[PDB]
Amino acid sequence: TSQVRQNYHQDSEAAINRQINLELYASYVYLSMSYYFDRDDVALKNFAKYFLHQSHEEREHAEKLMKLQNQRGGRIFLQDIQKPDEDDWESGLNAMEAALHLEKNVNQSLLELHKLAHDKNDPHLADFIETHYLNEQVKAIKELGDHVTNLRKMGAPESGLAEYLFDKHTLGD
Amino acid sequence: STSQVRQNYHQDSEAAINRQINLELYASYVYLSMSYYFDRDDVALKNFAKYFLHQSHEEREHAEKLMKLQNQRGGRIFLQDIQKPDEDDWESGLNAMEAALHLEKNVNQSLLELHKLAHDKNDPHLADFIETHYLNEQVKAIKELGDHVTNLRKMGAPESGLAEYLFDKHTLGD
Amino acid sequence: STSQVRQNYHQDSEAAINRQINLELYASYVYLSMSYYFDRDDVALKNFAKYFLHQSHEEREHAEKLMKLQNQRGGRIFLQDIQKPDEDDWESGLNAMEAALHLEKNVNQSLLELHKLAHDKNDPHLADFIETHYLNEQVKAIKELGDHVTNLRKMGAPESGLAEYLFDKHTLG
Amino acid sequence: TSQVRQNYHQDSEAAINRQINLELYASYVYLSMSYYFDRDDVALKNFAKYFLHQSHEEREHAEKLMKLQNQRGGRIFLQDIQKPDEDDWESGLNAMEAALHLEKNVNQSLLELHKLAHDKNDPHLADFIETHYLNEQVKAIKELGDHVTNLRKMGAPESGLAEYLFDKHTLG
Numbered sequence A: 001t002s003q004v005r006q007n008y009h010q011d012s013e014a015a016i017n018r019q020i021n022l023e024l025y026a027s028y029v030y031l032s033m034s035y036y037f038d039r040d041d042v043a044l045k046n047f048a049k050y051f052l053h054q055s056h057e058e059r060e061h062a063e064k065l066m067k068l069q070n071q072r073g074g075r076i077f078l079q080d081i082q083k084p085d086e087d088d089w090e091s092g093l094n095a096m097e098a099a100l101h102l103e104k105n106v107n108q109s110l111l112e113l114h115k116l117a118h119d120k121n122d123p124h125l126a127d128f129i130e131t132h133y134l135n136e137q138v139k140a141i142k143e144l145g146d147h148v149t150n151l152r153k154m155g156a157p158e159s160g161l162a163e164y165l166f167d168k169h170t171l172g173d
Numbered sequence B: 001s002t003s004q005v006r007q008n009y010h011q012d013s014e015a016a017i018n019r020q021i022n023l024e025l026y027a028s029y030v031y032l033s034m035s036y037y038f039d040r041d042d043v044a045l046k047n048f049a050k051y052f053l054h055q056s057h058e059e060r061e062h063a064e065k066l067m068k069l070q071n072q073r074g075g076r077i078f079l080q081d082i083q084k085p086d087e088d089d090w091e092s093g094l095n096a097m098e099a100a101l102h103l104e105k106n107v108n109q110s111l112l113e114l115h116k117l118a119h120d121k122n123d124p125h126l127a128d129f130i131e132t133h134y135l136n137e138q139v140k141a142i143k144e145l146g147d148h149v150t151n152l153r154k155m156g157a158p159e160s161g162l163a164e165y166l167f168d169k170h171t172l173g174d
Numbered sequence C: 001s002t003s004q005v006r007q008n009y010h011q012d013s014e015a016a017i018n019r020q021i022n023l024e025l026y027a028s029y030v031y032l033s034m035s036y037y038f039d040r041d042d043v044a045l046k047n048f049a050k051y052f053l054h055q056s057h058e059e060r061e062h063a064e065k066l067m068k069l070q071n072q073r074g075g076r077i078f079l080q081d082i083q084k085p086d087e088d089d090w091e092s093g094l095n096a097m098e099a100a101l102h103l104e105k106n107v108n109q110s111l112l113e114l115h116k117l118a119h120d121k122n123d124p125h126l127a128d129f130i131e132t133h134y135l136n137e138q139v140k141a142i143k144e145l146g147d148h149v150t151n152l153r154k155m156g157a158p159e160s161g162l163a164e165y166l167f168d169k170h171t172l173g
Numbered sequence D: 001t002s003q004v005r006q007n008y009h010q011d012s013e014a015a016i017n018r019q020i021n022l023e024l025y026a027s028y029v030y031l032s033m034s035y036y037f038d039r040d041d042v043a044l045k046n047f048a049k050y051f052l053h054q055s056h057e058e059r060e061h062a063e064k065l066m067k068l069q070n071q072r073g074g075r076i077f078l079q080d081i082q083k084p085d086e087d088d089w090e091s092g093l094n095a096m097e098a099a100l101h102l103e104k105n106v107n108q109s110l111l112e113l114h115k116l117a118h119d120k121n122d123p124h125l126a127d128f129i130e131t132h133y134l135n136e137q138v139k140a141i142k143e144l145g146d147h148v149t150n151l152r153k154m155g156a157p158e159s160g161l162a163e164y165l166f167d168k169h170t171l172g
């Protein structure tokens, strides 16, 4: 048993390992989307930059969880990072919708992890989730929601003009 | 007891000033409501939101200046309930702009009646207070709302969501 | 219909947030009233006025932040009439401070009931929103009001007008 | 008749000359008060500075009225500046009260002058009074009101401590 481990339940440790894998998976999804919009027959550079930045973000979430694992004396156990469900993301609207869905899966997972910390009386872990992840998930979900709303309002995915202008005026600054 | 500073300040003027204070606070409430209507995830027009929030704080300033005037002339401030806006859902940017134009025309008419009253009561300080701090600000606000409505309509709003998106970007994104 | 971002956001929490929005606006109105009470020519405590006006703007910020949260979690804002304060004449600086302490303790109790609600409904994001943005701010405001009341009393308020003048100069100035 | 005069009624011209005299009188009052609080047996340096500043301000009001008179083609006619009603102003509270009273007299005169401009259809003169005098009078009257209120609550004029601390923390 680790010399630092204190009040860190094995269930919390396993849940943290699974959450690490999930964050890495999300990072992979965003990488895929970004270079999908980098394609010469899609050519939405701001969608590309947006989803690449999100990918690096997920990388940071994962690495922070691995840091937490070491801090509490748990042991990191990595699993295969599954490839995303799609190779072709269709359009900017569809990519935003898949990102909203993914983000709500990740959020649900973090809510279950926080409930686990609460039931196991792990206030440090619950506060870690609260402080570093819960509000970031809420903000990401709201932002994706606004993007979906505006793209649909503009006429996506039917309007390539719509996705072009959204790429320029919304994701371009 | 009569205020030590009170001079040429008619009781009708004092009551009209309290009513105008409440009207300004009401306008502020309206603008707050509109702003956070455009803050919704299923509306998502951040520049409409920022615009109407700025208008809301402005109305706040209008009220506070009216209360300061009230104290300056020796009147007594009496606050009333601030009524909630007529709408919870503002439909679209075009409709919010039209409701705002209408509201501003109500506030302007109220201020014009206040200036008529001050003039009839031979209150040049109050008439000049209204003139200098409110009348032209109302004319400018009404002209600006009018231009916004005109452009949103020419662009194809509210049927065209592209119209309100682009208007939010290129006109209110400032 | 259900918001596309709504996740783990209970209707009871949503209604409580609407009521809290109204309460924050009510407090803002109270503070406005007090401020311009001390702006009167027969009271003339400019630092009491500035203090309570600042408190009013602060309350406004509390409200707008609650409305932002409402939209973030997918709830729907429903505004109600803002009731006028209980007093038009606040008597003295001491009495205004005590009325403010009372108001702040009611607002704090409301927020504590909101946090209990978020906890029982397993809403860690809402519980952390309340915790981080409201609980300690209420505690600090209550402590400050308590110190002000204590000092005014010790100086001899409200019977001694010198007390409230000097307090306005050296404490609120 | 002046080459510039237009829509300037003789009544307005005479009223402007009287207002010039009134402003100068007020300046005199404030000068007297200032050097009263400069006395070695009063020694309220901030009351003194305050009332001296008021005196110079009144001078500015007068000179702006004389400038206006020349602008409209009227002719300035100066009269004796009457000495203040008092040589000894008693205390800071009493000086503030006399200043509030004086300022309400000057404000009343300015309001009569404005009503005169309205009845004579002189919008330029009415707006001159509105923009340059009315609100300044309201602010001065309110400020004197605040000062009187505070000096009284503090225990003036019976308490010399009250007027000392007021001189330090409010007018200082």
Ligand SMILES: O=C(Cc1ccc(CC(=O)NO)cc1)NO
Pocket (backbone or CB within 6 Å): B119, B120, D119
């Ligand atoms: O302007 C008017 C009409 C009016 C008022 C006063 C006069 C002057 C007068 O009556 N002199 O005997 C004229 C017109 N009312 O606001």
Ligand SMILES: [Zn+2]
Pocket (backbone or CB within 6 Å): A023, A026, A057, A058, A061, A106
């Ligand atoms: Zn993540």
Ligand SMILES: [Zn+2]
Pocket (backbone or CB within 6 Å): A026, A058, A103, A106, A140
């Ligand atoms: Zn994410």
Ligand SMILES: [Zn+2]
Pocket (backbone or CB within 6 Å): B024, B027, B058, B059, B062, B107
């Ligand atoms: Zn207004």
Ligand SMILES: [Zn+2]
Pocket (backbone or CB within 6 Å): B027, B059, B104, B107, B141
């Ligand atoms: Zn307005």
Ligand SMILES: [Zn+2]
Pocket (backbone or CB within 6 Å): C024, C027, C058, C059, C062, C107
């Ligand atoms: Zn608050």
Ligand SMILES: [Zn+2]
Pocket (backbone or CB within 6 Å): C027, C059, C104, C107, C141
């Ligand atoms: Zn508060």
Ligand SMILES: [Zn+2]
Pocket (backbone or CB within 6 Å): A118, C119
């Ligand atoms: Zn619990």
Ligand SMILES: [Zn+2]
Pocket (backbone or CB within 6 Å): A127, A130, C127, C128, C131
């Ligand atoms: Zn916490």
Ligand SMILES: [Zn+2]
Pocket (backbone or CB within 6 Å): D023, D026, D057, D058, D061, D106
């Ligand atoms: Zn003067």
Ligand SMILES: [Zn+2]
Pocket (backbone or CB within 6 Å): D026, D058, D103, D106, D140
């Ligand atoms: Zn003067």
Ligand SMILES: [Zn+2]
Pocket (backbone or CB within 6 Å): B119, D118
């Ligand atoms: Zn008229």
Ligand SMILES: [Zn+2]
Pocket (backbone or CB within 6 Å): C170, D169
């Ligand atoms: Zn001191």
